[PDB]
Design a protein around this ligand. Structure first.
Ligand SMILES: CCCCCCCC/C=C\CCCCCCCC(=O)OC[C@H](COP(=O)(O)OCC[N+](C)(C)C)OC(=O)CCCCCCC/C=C\CCCCCCCC
Length: 269
């Protein structure tokens, strides 16, 4: 079991992120869906636990046959590659549990996130146990840093070091945009502390795949947030009410696209 916490500082407020994240997840899902693969939203309902925690529940399935590397592909029968995502989104807090029916208990990708109005300086925000938290590598993802992006993933239109929002005036993010957040009254900020736990108990592959999965998560978080910022003008004025409507349409769209369109998005690698 390999744990790492990815801290993503962003030039948006905690409240704005709640909308930007929902908007961006919708667009990112569609960009990867078609030809039978991609995202399928099964459940999207509001929930309330005994303790009173309220939030939004979603159950999705990521069909991943040809989008996964060959060493992963020739590892299980077709269809066995799909993974399920169940998330209890009680924003600012969220717990996401990803599973695989084939490996059952041997597989787990859990992402627990705390969205704080600070600059990523809170240690052990998920309040684990002292020693355990010591074995948690903390990694910072700088959405402005070109060297943190994979060459094949780069797209100038999704580069915040070149993007300037027309509606807010934020951007482009320079090499020192972070340290700058403290000088300007404008340009709000927050930090997503994403604790990722990966378990892949497979004889002889555990170490390789648990590390491979973290890299893909780091890669996803980097591209996702660079896109979220660059899409700032598309969602900053949306309300939570706009999102809900947009989500019900997205669900339909994902299904439609998945059956017609050919496979699209990030090719295996
Ligand atoms: C024997 C066989 C067993 C093996 C099984 C195969 C395992 C696959 C191996 C590697 C794959 C690792 C990459 C994980 C891909 C799944 C994406 C993922 O883990 O999503 C979760 C992340 C973090 O959770 P969250 O709480 O932040 O948000 C969700 C909660 N909510 C909605 C309330 C905000 O969500 C986010 O960052 C938001 C972005 C979500 C939307 C992106 C759509 C992705 C669709 C396709 C991905 C294509 C890439 C395939 C990788 C191939 C490698 C080359």
């Amino acid at each position: 079991v390999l744990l790492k916490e990815y801290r993503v500082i962003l030039p948006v407020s905690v409240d704005e992120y709640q909308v930007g994240q929902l908007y961006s997840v919708a667009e990112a899902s569609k960009n990867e869906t078609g030809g039978g693969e991609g995202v399928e939203v099964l459940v999207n309902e509001p929930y309330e636990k005994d303790d009173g925690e309220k939030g939004q529940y979603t159950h999705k399935i990521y069909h991943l046959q040809s989008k996964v590397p060959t060493f992963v592909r020739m590892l299980a029968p077709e269809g066995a590659l799909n993974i399920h995502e169940k998330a209890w989104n009680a924003y600012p807090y969220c717990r996401t549990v990803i599973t695989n029916e084939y490996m059952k208990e041997d597989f787990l990708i859990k992402i627990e996130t705390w969205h704080k109005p600070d600059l990523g300086t809170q240690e052990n925000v998920h309040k684990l146990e002292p020693e355990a938290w010591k074995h948690v590598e903390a990694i910072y993802i700088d959405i402005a840093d070109r060297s943190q992006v994979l060459s094949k993933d780069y797209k100038a239109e999704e580069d915040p070091a070149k993007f300037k929002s027309i509606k807010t005036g934020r951007g482009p993010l320079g090499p020192n945009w972070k340290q700058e957040l403290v000088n300007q009254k404008d340009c709000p900020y927050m930090c997503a502390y994403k604790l990722v736990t990966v378990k892949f108990k497979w004889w002889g592959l555990q170490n390789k795949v648990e590390n491979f999965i973290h890299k893909q998560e780091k890669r996803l978080f980097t591209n996702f947030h660079r896109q979220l910022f660059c899409w700032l003008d598309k969602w900053v004025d949306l309300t939570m009410d706009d999102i809900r409507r947009m989500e019900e349409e997205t669900k339909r769209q994902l299904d439609e696209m998945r059956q017609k369109d050919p496979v699209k998005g990030m090719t295996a690698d």
